[model samples]
Target: AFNNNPSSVGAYSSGTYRNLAQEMGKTNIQQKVNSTFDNMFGYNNTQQLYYPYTENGVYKAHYIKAINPDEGDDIRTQGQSWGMTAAVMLNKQEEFDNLWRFAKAYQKNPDNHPDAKKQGVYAWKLKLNQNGFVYKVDEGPAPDGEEYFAFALLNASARWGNSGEFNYYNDAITMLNTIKNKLMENQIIRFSPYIDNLTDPSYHIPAFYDYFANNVTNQADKNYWRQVATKSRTLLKNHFTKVSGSPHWNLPTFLSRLDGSPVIGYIFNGQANPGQWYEFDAWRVIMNVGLDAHLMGAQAWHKSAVNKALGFLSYAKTNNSKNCYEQVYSYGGAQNRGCAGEGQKAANAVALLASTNAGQANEFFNEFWSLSQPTGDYRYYNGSLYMLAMLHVSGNFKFYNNTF
Candidate 1:
């Protein structure tokens, strides 16, 4: 059964794109985003509500724990990330506000109450039964997994004026430091790690470092993050296979048992898949480096990585069928089944929104808009992705482009 039951229109409106000018940009990007908005919100006849929802309002998504909810984590995270992207790229005030609200809601302190802790990072629905929060259920925390959510929180907090209510800047820095010391110290070879243990050396670590270096205030903290980022990148480059220009999601690990024997039973697909790895974890690294490079008036490592990632995307486009876009590329040799229900539409929107070609983006947006039929498979990550994709299309990047 669904848990939240809030309207998508209300949620979308609460997002960062508060004005038309801020929402509209880059002809091609705008078309696809508008198409997605029309499909998702237009079908429900609530397009006009975008003006009323504010960051402080409550948003409910039915089927929080249910198998399917039109709004899920992928949608929400995508929204939050995209909102930050939009703020940075488009300078939209509404998008910033909306992004701020979502970040606050998702990363809010869980220690306040038992229910809140159980709710974890972001609860789809406020409930009385569920015991503990499910951290990234499908992908096992690689690539764009739980860590990215934390990174997004950090990025959003830094970008949104760093209010007291959202003190994630320091929290994010601390979280990454802990993860680095506890997880990525010596055993693992690279940034891609299993989600099973928080202290495992194989855990994903680059994006956190990227966010930290880009947003943290203290010189010592920034330097520490820089060190971690360089180390993690070097390690990952050494261990993970970059077949066809994409890094493999998983590598055999001895980090777990300390015997250096391969952990044969563990599967390592989902967020870490070589082809889509950048989309999940490495994208932030590339983006940050690119921006930093530009700021420093030097060619940055970001562009090379981005080009490599784009190459991967190109490979996916050429080698895989257009229909493959439906599949959620798992890093551990899992089937590439398309995102189910609303997720499919959301994913399609993201692919197109992120695409460089305006024509392709528009085409994708038109094809998948309102395509989701809701088979009751909504997930927290699904909602996050959908929202993120929406924000991306909407051109809201300020939610993430913070310098303090």
Candidate 2:
């Protein structure tokens, strides 16, 4: 680790989220973990989350990219990284390796190496068949997938040590450098190789950048990462604001233009229309911000910049469903989509975790503790957040060491 103690502002650290949940009478972490991965992994359990099999004598795994069987071997880099992260946090080394094997098989690293402008990251979308046949559906990158993969790998290195098949430590650092050089131009993570020169609030996770800065040995690289982390937080501070003169405030899933206008376009995967509203993708900010707050301390929350948004979410969550909240809303306007979905539930849980309101946090934690794993059609996005939330709330999601 950086200074021998388990790292939190970066890399690995002993998780305290579980202890807090348990002592607060929200001890459903293990149960949530058990129900989540047990059904989500293995032989494509009824939810059709993931399954492993042999492909041409090579051990490989496929993630259920869709909840519906008809989605037909859908595989996504999102699932790849998220599943791997969940496995690492849960300490299920077997599943973690299995998921990475699938990723390695398909990961497209740019052959041009250091100066490569594009390509070489994991494909964000794919499709496979029951016969162990795989096909590329979309050829691009998911910023979230890349960062999560690095984080999970760093964790794997810390827990299992850098040995055996996975070069967890070395590869983790290499991936970060690759991302710094290839995926981003000025240390700001672009939407992907496809969409650059814009910003998506969902892609901002300062803790990961902090980890890169803390663990990288090179002084220049470390400083650059530190700058990125700070810039990301600045963007975070600008995430929400009052609705003109209304008492309401808003946050959107994506932002572009210097005018602070939220991007209004179809999502790459078409999961939902990510427009100038707080919708599916926007829910992730809660988890991101809350985790950043948890790992790096209260400056992320109490620093006044983000607290307005935090207050809005806290009020919304407490007023609506404790776990999710009204699923979507206008960023700078007033509109309602529906109740909290899978992603929103987890996000709301995270927001509460960082909340200073102990009574309300406990109240929500009680309901979140009993939140069941998602099932049925269209569970893909929901299931992803479901499992991720389970890991985070359970204290299983931890920090890992890339530097020894």
Candidate 3:
């Protein structure tokens, strides 16, 4: 039987990957990992994001809903995918299966959508009832959810095999083919299936592409995945250049013009604001880049970019008398908003794993260590990222190849 211990299963583990906590002269890494996971996934916990429901004593599904009053009660594909990914990483197979079951049942786009391009991919959002059922489904695709879904499914197949409730391996293959056929244009991942020429930089995870390249069946598909990997890295490098000239690595929220240029005055529900700030969606880029650097072996450029972003965050902390960070910033280090996000703080620590400076990495790790476990209306996003960051730094987020 498979042990299902993440630290013992995949490529990233002690002696193979750097445990940031240990390097920072801290212990209790795994204990904190357990605590965070339990807080998010525990059935009776107040902060738990997951809720499971069954009908007629046979039908069953689970949903994750984040309560933001202004946003109403909605289940986001972003949170769903993140929940599944976290479950798989932590080797909670039951929770992984439950979450995927909910996503498969409710979030997937119908075959009859007006935009054929939206078919097969999952919807980005759905309205939720107090009883944990979803309604008023939105027929849009956010490529990031599909991206994480594919990776999590593949990892599930690798870790637990496909003999259980779902054929994990085949599901992942179908998702990959759907993403290739419907969600991508000119080898670049689209921000949404309805939008052809824009992308969210945080969605381009090269390690996922690399995994697809290594595992997919067809030779042509394998080659295409490799190109996708390179294109993604190129896109990220281009985004880094958009914010500042050199020695800085601030990322914008969206890239447009098909060549990865930062878009200004980008319309989000008819707003005229420039979309080139390091805002909410852009926070994940730090974690993505850092994970890629460590998992794929950091190049000189990767190290430089990670270190530069860390330098800015480090300086920001010191510059503030209250020890608070600005949550939003222009790529040029100008503050656009005040107050820090727990999610961003977690992301910064994950990025620190790629840092060249041991002293600074420790400082960031200290800040992350002191944060309370995320709860309340904002807990969904912050808690999800917090779990992932904890997994990465503790050497528990593994690259599941099934050699075990």
Candidate 4:
């Protein structure tokens, strides 16, 4: 039912690619791609997450803003890196450079912050003014953002050349080194550079690790990057065993211990946090796994897991579409009743690469294809994920290797 090849990285790097959108007969994909990106990065677009700031009528830089004013409405390294990844993949160099500049100038900790010792580190959260300038910063580093930052920069260097105003390859190497030196405990990537004993399942992107293993400057640490990829797959596999009975095959927000069991409670940044639910953060597991399968190759376990996950989702879409989108779920059960959000739909669709159930996979693909570009005040996280998922499913999100 699926190609569970273990050496499929060539499909992404050198061989023929699989365009899930084309397989689904989506002829208007390019149009959707343009409109989706326009809504987010276009000038004067109402649904934009990418924003340009100015000082005294002079243009400054671009920042990715989370539109939820109620939720501090801050800028985030997460969105910034995600935006840069999208930008590089779309060949929008200006947008990528602008977002990177904002991350460096405002999100990166100043020389005076307590955590400034971690060079190339950026604050995970930030409060900004009307001009998209940071007024307050979280000061702590989120490892996931750093991961994507390096990944995006590497791809940028591969796609846009390294001799430009921004030396994308050098910048990526610096960031990769920072993550290796500051964010890991043993070999596992931490939830934060400033915390311990926890990992986000969504952040364990082995595809990125595979890229770093070969592309980074530290030749001696190349094996270390490969080891990280192996460890990440193990972590994900361990978590899968914990949720063997889950209907949706949902993931947790956090994992701990050597076996990667879900952590119900944890302390981070001196605040109590819940880590067991399948919520906003955990939603990316399917996308991450599927993207890895597309890039690195589909393992037997990943194919089975993704198939089951999409099976449940496709079942619900046909039998009970209203119950499909809950705000929270524990492993396989819904914690509350709600509607399917754009982010969930988008993430679910990307699992098609690893899914054995073509009918179920196409159900997801069609539903996601019909979704409009996310709008309104709370569109940042959903919209950003939505854009990436779009690129992944459309086969536009390539792992840039040789210079393009």
Output the number of the lDDT-best candidate: 4
* True-structure lDDT of candidate 3: 0.76
> If ranked by lDDT, best first, what sequence of candidates would result?
4, 3, 2, 1
Candidate 1 C-alpha lDDT tens digits along 133-232: 3233322113223445456556556555656555656556654553444334352323333343222223434444655576667787678777766665
Error of 1 at 88 (Å): 11
Give candidate 3 regions above 4 Å deviation.
1-15, 54-59, 130-132, 245-251, 268-273, 318-321, 331-336, 402-404
Higher-ranked by TM-score: 1 or 3: 3
Question: Candidate 3's error at 76, in angstroms?
Answer: 1.1
Most TM-score-accurate candidate: 4
For residues 181-229, could you state the per-residue lDDT of candidate 4 as single tens digits? 7788778888766566767788889878988887865567889999999
Local distance difference test, per candidate?
0.38, 0.65, 0.76, 0.76
Who is ahead in lDDT, 1 or 2? Answer: 2
Give me the displacement of residue 178 in model 4, in angstroms: 1.0
The digit string of per-residue lDDT tens for model 2 on 183-219 reads: 7746667775655556667778888888777777889
TM-scores for every candidate against the unseen true structure: 0.46, 0.83, 0.90, 0.91
* Span of 10 residues, lowest total lDDT, candidate 1: 1-10
Rank by TM-score, descending?
4, 3, 2, 1
Q: Supply candidate 1's per-residue lDDT for 220.
A: 79
